[PDB]
Short mmCIF file of C-alpha atoms in Angstrom, two decimals:
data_model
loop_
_atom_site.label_atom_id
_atom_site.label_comp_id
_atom_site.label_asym_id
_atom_site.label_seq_id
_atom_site.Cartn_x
_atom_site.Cartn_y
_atom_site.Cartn_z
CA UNK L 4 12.57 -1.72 15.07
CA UNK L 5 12.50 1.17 12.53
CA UNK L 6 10.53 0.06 9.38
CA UNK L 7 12.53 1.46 6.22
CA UNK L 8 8.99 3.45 4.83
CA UNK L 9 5.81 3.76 5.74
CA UNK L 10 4.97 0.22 3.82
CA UNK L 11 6.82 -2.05 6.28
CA UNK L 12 5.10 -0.38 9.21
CA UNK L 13 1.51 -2.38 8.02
CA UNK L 14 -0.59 -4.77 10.65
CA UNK L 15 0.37 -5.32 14.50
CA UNK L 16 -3.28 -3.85 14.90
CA UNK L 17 -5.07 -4.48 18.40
CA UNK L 18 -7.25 -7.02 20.16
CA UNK L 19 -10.38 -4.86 21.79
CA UNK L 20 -13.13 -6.80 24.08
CA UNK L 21 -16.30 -5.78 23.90
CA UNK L 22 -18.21 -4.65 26.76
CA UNK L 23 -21.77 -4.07 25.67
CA UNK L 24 -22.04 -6.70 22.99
CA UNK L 25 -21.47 -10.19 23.33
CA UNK L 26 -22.04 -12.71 26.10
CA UNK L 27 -19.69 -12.63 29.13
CA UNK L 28 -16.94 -10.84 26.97
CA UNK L 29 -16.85 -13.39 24.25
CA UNK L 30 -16.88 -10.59 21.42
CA UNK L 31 -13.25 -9.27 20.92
CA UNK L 32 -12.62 -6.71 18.12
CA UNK L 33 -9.63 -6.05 15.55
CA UNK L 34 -8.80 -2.68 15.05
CA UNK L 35 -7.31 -2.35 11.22
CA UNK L 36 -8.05 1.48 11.28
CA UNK L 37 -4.28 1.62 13.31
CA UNK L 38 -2.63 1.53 9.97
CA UNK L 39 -0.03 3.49 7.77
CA UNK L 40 -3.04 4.87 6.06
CA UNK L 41 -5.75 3.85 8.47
CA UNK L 42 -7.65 1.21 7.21
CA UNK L 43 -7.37 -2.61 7.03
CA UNK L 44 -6.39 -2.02 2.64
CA UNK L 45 -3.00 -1.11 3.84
CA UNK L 46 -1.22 -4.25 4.08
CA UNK L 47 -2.98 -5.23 0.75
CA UNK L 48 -1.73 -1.72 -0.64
CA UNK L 49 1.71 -2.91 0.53
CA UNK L 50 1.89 -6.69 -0.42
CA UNK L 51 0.06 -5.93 -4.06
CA UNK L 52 3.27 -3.87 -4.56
CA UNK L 53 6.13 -5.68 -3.21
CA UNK L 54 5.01 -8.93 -4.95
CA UNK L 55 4.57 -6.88 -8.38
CA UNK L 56 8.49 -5.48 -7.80
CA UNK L 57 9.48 -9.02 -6.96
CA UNK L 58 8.16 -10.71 -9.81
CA UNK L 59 9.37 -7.67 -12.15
CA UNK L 60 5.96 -6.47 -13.11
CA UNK L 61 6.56 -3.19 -11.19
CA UNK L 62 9.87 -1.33 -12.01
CA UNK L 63 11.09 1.85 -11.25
CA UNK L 64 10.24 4.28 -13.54
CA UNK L 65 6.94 1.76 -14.20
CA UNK L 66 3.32 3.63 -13.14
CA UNK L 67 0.43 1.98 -10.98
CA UNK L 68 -2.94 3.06 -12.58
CA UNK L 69 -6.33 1.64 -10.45
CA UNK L 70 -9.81 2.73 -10.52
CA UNK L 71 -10.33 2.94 -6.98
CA UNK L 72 -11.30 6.03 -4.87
CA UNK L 73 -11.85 3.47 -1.46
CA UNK L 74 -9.67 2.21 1.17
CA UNK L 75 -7.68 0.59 -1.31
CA UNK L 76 -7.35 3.70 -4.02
CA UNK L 77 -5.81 5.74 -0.51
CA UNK L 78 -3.49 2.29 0.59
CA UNK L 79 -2.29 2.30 -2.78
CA UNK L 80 -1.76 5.89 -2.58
CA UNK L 81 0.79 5.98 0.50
CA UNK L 82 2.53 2.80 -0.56
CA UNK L 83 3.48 4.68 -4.37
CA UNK L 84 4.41 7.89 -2.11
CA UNK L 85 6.41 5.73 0.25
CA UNK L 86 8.50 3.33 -2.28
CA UNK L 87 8.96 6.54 -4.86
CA UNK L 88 6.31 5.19 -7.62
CA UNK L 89 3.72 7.87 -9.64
CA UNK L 90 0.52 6.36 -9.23
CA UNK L 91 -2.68 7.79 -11.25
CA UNK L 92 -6.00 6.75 -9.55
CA UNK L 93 -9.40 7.12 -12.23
CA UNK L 94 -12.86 8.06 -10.46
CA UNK L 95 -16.66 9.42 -11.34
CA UNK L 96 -16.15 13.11 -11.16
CA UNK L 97 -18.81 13.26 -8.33
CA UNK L 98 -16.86 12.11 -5.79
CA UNK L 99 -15.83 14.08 -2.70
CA UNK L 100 -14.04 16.85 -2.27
CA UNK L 101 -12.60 15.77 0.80
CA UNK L 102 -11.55 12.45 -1.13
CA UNK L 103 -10.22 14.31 -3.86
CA UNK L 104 -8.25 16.25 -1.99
CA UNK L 105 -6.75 13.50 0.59
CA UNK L 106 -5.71 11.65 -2.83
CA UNK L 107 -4.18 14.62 -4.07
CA UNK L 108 -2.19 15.33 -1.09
CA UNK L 109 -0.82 11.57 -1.30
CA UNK L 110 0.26 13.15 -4.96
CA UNK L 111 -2.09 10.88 -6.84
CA UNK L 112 -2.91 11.48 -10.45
CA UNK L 113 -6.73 11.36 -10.65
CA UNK L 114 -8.25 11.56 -13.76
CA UNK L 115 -12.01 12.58 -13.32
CA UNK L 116 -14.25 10.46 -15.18
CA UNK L 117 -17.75 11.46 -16.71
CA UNK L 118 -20.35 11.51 -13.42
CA UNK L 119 -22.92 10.14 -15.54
CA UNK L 120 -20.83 7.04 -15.78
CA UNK L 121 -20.22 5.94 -12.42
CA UNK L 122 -17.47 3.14 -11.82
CA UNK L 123 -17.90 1.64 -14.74
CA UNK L 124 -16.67 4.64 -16.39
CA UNK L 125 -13.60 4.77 -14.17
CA UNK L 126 -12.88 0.96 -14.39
CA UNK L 127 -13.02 1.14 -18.09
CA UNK L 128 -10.89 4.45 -18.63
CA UNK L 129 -8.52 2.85 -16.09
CA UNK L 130 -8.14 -0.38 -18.42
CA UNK L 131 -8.01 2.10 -21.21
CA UNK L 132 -4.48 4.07 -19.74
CA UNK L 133 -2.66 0.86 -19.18
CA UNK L 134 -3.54 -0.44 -22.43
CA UNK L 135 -2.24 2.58 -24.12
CA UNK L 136 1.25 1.68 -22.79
CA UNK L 137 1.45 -2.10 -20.93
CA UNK L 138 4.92 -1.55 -20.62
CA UNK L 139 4.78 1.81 -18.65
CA UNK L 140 1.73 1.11 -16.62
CA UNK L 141 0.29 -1.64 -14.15
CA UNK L 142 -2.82 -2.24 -12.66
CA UNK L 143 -2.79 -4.08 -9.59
CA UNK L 144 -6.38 -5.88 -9.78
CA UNK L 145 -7.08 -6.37 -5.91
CA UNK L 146 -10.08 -8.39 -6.50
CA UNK L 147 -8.24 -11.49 -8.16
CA UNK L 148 -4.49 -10.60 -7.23
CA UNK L 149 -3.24 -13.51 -4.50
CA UNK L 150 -0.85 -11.11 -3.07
CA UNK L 151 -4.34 -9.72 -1.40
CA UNK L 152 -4.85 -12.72 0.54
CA UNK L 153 -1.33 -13.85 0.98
CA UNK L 154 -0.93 -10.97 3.48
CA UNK L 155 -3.71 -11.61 5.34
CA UNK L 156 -2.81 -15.23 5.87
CA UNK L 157 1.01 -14.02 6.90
CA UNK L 158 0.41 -11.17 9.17
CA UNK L 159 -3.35 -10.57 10.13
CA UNK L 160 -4.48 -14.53 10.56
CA UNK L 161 -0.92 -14.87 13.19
CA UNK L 162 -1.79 -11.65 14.69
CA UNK L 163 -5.35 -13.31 15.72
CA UNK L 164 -3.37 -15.95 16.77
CA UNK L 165 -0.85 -15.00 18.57
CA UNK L 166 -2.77 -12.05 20.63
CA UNK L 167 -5.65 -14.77 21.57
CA UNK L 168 -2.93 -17.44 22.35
CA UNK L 169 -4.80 -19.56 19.76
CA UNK L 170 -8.17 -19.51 21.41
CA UNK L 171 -9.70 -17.52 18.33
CA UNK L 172 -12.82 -20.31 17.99
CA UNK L 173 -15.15 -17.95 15.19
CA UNK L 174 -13.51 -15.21 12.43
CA UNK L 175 -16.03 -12.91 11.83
CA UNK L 176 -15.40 -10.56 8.59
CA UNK L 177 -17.44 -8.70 6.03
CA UNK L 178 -16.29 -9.26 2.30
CA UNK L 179 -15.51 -6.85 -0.36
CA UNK L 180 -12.68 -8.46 -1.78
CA UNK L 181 -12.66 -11.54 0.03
CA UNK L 182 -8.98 -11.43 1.16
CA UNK L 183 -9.47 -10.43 4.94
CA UNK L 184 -11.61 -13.42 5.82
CA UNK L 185 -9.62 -16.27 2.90
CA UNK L 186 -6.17 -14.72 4.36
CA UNK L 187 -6.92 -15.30 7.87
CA UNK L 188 -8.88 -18.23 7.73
CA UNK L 189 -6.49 -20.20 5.49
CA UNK L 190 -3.64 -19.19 8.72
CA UNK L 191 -5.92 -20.16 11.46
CA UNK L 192 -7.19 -23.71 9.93
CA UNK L 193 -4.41 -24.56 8.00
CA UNK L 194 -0.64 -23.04 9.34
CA UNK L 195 -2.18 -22.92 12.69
CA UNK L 196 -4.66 -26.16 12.23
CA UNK L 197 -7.49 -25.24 14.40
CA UNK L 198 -11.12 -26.00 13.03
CA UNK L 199 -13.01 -22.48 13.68
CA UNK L 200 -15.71 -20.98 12.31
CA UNK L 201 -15.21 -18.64 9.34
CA UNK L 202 -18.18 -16.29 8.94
CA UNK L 203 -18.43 -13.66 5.96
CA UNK L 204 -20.34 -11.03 6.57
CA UNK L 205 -22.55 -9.14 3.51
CA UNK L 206 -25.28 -6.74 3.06
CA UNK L 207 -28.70 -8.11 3.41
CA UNK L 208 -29.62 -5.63 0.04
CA UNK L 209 -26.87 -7.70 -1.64
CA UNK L 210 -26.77 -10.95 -0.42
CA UNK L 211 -24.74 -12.25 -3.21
CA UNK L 212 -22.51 -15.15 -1.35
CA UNK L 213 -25.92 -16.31 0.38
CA UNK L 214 -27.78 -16.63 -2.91
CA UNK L 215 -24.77 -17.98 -4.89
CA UNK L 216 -24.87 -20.77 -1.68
CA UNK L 217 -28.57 -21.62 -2.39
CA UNK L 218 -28.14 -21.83 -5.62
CA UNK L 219 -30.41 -18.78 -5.64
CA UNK L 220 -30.89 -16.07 -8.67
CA UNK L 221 -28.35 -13.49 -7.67
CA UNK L 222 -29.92 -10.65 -7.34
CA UNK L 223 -27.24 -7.24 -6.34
CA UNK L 224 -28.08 -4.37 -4.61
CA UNK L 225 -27.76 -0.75 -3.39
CA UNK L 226 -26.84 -0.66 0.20
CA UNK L 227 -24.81 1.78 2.54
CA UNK L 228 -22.44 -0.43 4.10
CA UNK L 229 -19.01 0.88 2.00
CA UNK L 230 -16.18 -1.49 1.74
CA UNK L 231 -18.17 -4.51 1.34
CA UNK L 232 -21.09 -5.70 -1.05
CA UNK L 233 -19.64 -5.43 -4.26
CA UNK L 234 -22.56 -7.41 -5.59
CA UNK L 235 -20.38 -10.29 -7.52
CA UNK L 236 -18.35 -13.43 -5.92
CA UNK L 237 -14.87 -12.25 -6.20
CA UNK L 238 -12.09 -14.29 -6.88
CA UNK L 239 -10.17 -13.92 -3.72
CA UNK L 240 -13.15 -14.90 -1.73
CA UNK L 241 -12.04 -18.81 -1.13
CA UNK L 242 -15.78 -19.69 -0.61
CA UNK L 243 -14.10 -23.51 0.15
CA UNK L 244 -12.98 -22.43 3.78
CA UNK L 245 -16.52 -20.20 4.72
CA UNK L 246 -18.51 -22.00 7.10
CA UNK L 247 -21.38 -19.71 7.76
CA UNK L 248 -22.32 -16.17 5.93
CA UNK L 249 -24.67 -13.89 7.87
CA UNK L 250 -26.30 -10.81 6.25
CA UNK L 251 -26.74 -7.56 7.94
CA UNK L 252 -29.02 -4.17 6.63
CA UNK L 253 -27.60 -0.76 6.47
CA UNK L 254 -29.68 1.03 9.30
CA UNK L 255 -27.85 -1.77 11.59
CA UNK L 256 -24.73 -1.47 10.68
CA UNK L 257 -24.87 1.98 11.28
CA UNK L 258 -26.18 2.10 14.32
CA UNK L 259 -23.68 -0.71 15.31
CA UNK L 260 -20.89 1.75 14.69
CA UNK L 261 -22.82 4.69 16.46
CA UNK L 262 -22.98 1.96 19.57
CA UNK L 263 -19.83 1.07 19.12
CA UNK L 264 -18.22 4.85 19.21
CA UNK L 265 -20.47 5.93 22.01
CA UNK L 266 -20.75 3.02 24.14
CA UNK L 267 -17.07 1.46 23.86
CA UNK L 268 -14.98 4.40 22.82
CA UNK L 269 -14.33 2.50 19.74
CA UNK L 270 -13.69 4.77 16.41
CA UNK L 271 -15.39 2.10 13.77
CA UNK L 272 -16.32 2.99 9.96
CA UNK L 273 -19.33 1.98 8.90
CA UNK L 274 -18.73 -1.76 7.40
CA UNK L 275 -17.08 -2.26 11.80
CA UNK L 276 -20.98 -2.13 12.62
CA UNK L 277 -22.24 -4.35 10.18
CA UNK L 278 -19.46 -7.19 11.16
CA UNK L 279 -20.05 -6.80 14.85
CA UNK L 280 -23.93 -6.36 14.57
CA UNK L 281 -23.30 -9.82 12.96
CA UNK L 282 -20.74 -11.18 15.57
CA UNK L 283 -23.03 -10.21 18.32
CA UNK L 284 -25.81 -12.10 16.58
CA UNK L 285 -23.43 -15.33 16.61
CA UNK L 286 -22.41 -13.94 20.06
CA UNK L 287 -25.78 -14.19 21.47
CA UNK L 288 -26.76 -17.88 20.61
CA UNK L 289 -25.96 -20.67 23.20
CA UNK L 290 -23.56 -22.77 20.89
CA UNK L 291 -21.27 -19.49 21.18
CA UNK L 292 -21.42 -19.05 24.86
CA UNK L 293 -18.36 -20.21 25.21
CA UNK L 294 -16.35 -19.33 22.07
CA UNK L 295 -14.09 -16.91 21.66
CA UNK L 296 -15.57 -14.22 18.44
CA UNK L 297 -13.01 -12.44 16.60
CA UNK L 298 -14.22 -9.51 14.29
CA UNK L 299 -12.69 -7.06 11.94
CA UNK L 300 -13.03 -3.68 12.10
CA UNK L 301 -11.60 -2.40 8.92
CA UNK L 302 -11.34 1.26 9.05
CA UNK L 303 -12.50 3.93 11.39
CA UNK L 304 -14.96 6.88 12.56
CA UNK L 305 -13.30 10.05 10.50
CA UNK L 306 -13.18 8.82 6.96
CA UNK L 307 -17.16 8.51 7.41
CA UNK L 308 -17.70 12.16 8.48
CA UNK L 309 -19.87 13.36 5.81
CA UNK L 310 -21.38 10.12 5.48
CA UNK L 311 -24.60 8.99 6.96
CA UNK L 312 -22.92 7.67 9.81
CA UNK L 313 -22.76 11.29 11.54
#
């Protein structure tokens, strides 16, 4: 069909197999870079807002104000641009140029926040603007906000289902907000009702959901492995439905997405390596022979130029 804007257009993304990972091609990869805006955050970008505008919170004339710079600061951005919203986005004013400017061009507000702050400084100034006028401005809180999930379990969980012809056996998804791998999971074992694994996926310098399972001190960390590790359990992470968590380093991840560019053609971001270095892990043990692995790749190679991964 012809979607209305860019919004509608979310999801449909493809089923890959892997060639040099895996055992007997049972590693299959889900490309959420082919997106309005090119990473896996757009159908959250687009769901966030059309729940807001159908429970009223988000009117015309109304303004979306979020402290992210990430996938979801640039989802965010094209959704606003599409459905005719202003949207101001706060961030550390050490960020990239080359993010700056790709915000900008989505005609984003961004307010520049004091470097020596960090996000902290943007999450807080953020809170600030809405609070100065509740009525004019609303923040769209992707870390707690169902409408993150929700999506995930209507479009991306079927997807997986329908392109596998419900042979998916193992989910395999790193976690920044948690919605990805409670979305899809919550389709798969519960609209679908097959009992597969659900693995989250987490940096091994932050190995918050693996501590938090122990009953460990949790202990958060630096690490390179952007989109994921955000060093606290967040609320859409339904740890009730996660049947295994597996960490992964940096170095690793990043090489995974090297491997994966040079080796399968495949055009992964940096947080792709780290869930298929952990898929092929899974991948490689003889209670998996057999299983079909699905992974998420949420964004891809270009928005990681400048970035260690070149």
């Amino acid at each position: 069909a012809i979607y209305a804007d860019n919004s509608y257009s979310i999801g449909n993304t493809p089923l890959v197999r892997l060639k040099h990972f895996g055992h007997n091609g049972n590693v299959v990869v889900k490309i959420e870079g082919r997106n309005p805006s090119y990473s896996v955050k757009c159908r959250i970008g687009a769901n966030m807002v059309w729940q807001a505008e159908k429970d009223g919170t988000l009117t015309k004339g109304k303004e979306i104000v979020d402290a992210t710079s990430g996938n979801t600061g640039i989802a965010l951005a094209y959704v606003a641009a599409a459905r005719g919203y202003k949207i101001t986005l706060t961030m550390p004013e050490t960020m990239s140029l080359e993010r700056k400017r790709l915000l900008c061009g989505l005609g984003v507000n961004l307010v520049l926040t004091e470097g020596a702050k960090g996000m902290k400084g943007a999450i807080a100034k953020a809170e600030e603007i809405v609070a100065s006028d509740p009525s004019r401005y609303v923040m769209l809180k992707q870390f707690e906000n169902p409408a993150n999930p929700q999506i995930h379990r209507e479009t991306t969980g079927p997807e997986i289902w329908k392109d596998t012809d419900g042979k998916v056996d193992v989910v395999v998804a790193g976690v920044g907000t948690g919605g990805s791998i409670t979305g899809i999971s919550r389709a798969i074992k519960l609209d679908f009702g097959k009992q597969i694994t659900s693995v989250a996926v987490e940096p091994v310098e932050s190995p918050v959901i693996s501590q938090t399972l122990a009953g460990e001190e949790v202990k958060p960390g630096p690490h390179k492995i952007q989109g994921i590790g955000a060093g606290f359990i967040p609320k859409n992470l339904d740890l009730s439905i996660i049947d295994r968590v597996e960490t992964v380093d940096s170095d690793t991840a990043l090489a995974t997405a090297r491997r994966l560019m040079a080796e399968e053609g495949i055009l992964a971001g940096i947080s792709s390596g780290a869930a298929v270095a952990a898929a092929d892990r899974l991948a490689k043990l003889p209670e998996f022979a057999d299983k079909l692995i699905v992974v998420i790749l949420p964004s891809a190679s270009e928005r990681y130029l400048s970035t260690a991964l070149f």
